[PDB]
Amino acid sequence: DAEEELKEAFKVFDKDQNGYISASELRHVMINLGEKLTDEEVEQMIKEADLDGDGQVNYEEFVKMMMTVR
Ligand SMILES: [Ca+2]
Ligand SMILES: [Ca+2]
Helix, strand or coil: HHHHHHHHHHHHHHCCCCCCHHHHHHHHHHHCCCCCHHHHHHHHHHHHHCCCCCCCHHEEEEHHHHHHHC
């Protein structure tokens, strides 16, 4: 079920449904959660979470990042 719930949530964040979560999509989520971090904080999270420096948070990075903070 973990892979399901995780896949589902991922599908929600993937507003563009491009298979990759964009920084903008992450920010919108933060607002929905009632949380707002500085641009430098979010930018750092994307960079820190991104293992391939692709600039985009991929499922592996998301789950991985999610596992970290959890
Ligand atoms: Ca997207
Ligand atoms: Ca990536």
